[PDB]
Amino acid sequence: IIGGEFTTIENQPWFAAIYRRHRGGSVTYVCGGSLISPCWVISATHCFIDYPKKEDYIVYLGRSRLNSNTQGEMKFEVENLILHKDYSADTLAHHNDIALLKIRSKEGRCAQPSRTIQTIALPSMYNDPQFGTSCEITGFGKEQSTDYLYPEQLKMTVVKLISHRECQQPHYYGSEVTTKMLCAADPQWKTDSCQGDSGGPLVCSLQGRMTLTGIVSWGRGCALKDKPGVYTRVSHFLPWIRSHT
Numbered sequence: 601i602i603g604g605e606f607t608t609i610e611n612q613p614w615f616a617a618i619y620r621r622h623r624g625g626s627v628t629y630v631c632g633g634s635l636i637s638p639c640w641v642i643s644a645t646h647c648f649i650d651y652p653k654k655e656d657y658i659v660y661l662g663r664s665r666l667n668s669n670t671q672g673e674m675k676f677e678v679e680n681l682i683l684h685k686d687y688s689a690d691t692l693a694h695h696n697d698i699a700l701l702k703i704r705s706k707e708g709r710c711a712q713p714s715r716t717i718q719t720i721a722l723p724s725m726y727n728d729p730q731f732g733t734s735c736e737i738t739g740f741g742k743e744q745s746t747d748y749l750y751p752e753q754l755k756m757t758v759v760k761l762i763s764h765r766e767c768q769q770p771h772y773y774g775s776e777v778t779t780k781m782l783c784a785a786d787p788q789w790k791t792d793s794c795q796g797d798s799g800g801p802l803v804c805s806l807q808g809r810m811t812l813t814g815i816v817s818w819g820r821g822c823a824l825k826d827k828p829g830v831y832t833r834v835s836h837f838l839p840w841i842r843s844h845t
């Protein structure tokens with residue numbers, strides 16, 4: 601997250617932290633995710649496509665820091681890793697960039713909701729907020745595009761939804777953006793998602809309730825003029841989500 605503010609997991613208690621085990625023993629951060637039911641985390645396919653073996657991954661819920669343990673956190677294995685069959689990637693765009701992780705603990709359990717661990721509601725079919733609507737994004741991604749390190753502490757920021765017409769302008773993304781994507785950005789381009797925020801939530805208030813509107817997918821740099829963040833449009837994937845869960 602470029603700009604924004606540091607936060608803790610209580611604020612975004614559906615946020616899932618996904619790591620990969622290396623051949624050797626080391627464990628590195630991969631991507632964010634969102635808890636949509638006790639046994640299911642939703643993320644982005646591009647996070648996993650290079651290493652599509654479920655046994656390599658570890659998922660944490662209730663975790664506010666990258667490389668230290670948060671009190672009350674839970675750790676899970678990946679029972680199932682479901683990538684979208686129609687995934688494709690262009691030089692920039694990732695199409696159908698959505699993935700489901702069924703989680704279960706060493707002892708065979710799913711998530712137990714708590715102050716630090718809660719599900720996020722899915723939107724109703726084809727129902728998104730109006731453009732200009734302020735939504736929140738969360739993750740452990742880079743604080744500056746040039747940084748080598750990821751932040752230790754979880755961050756969040758606010759971005760505003762951009763209309764499909766505005767996004768498809770040539771000086772923005774042209775046709776790279778489809779109707780199964782959403783664009784969001786700051787009016788000054790001063791705050792954004794970035795590398796390492798992939799798979800995490802874009803949350804908007806819908807029908808009076810926090811709702812998972814998007815999943816962090818791609819963009820051209822971070823917090824650059826005329827280059828919004830691009831998000832998988834969750835309201836266009838409900839049959840896929842309902843079927844695969």
Ligand SMILES: COc1ncc(-c2nc(C(=O)NC(=N)N)c(N)nc2N2CCCCCC2)c(OC)n1
Pocket residue numbers: 742744745746792793794795796797798816817818819820821822823827828829830
């Ligand atoms: C100009 O260089 C460049 N381009 C793309 C990325 C990148 N961006 C995002 C992203 O969300 N961008 C955005 N909201 N504008 C994102 N979610 N992921 C990004 N990766 C960079 C590597 C390629 C794609 C996977 C991770 C980047 O990050 C440091 N740097």
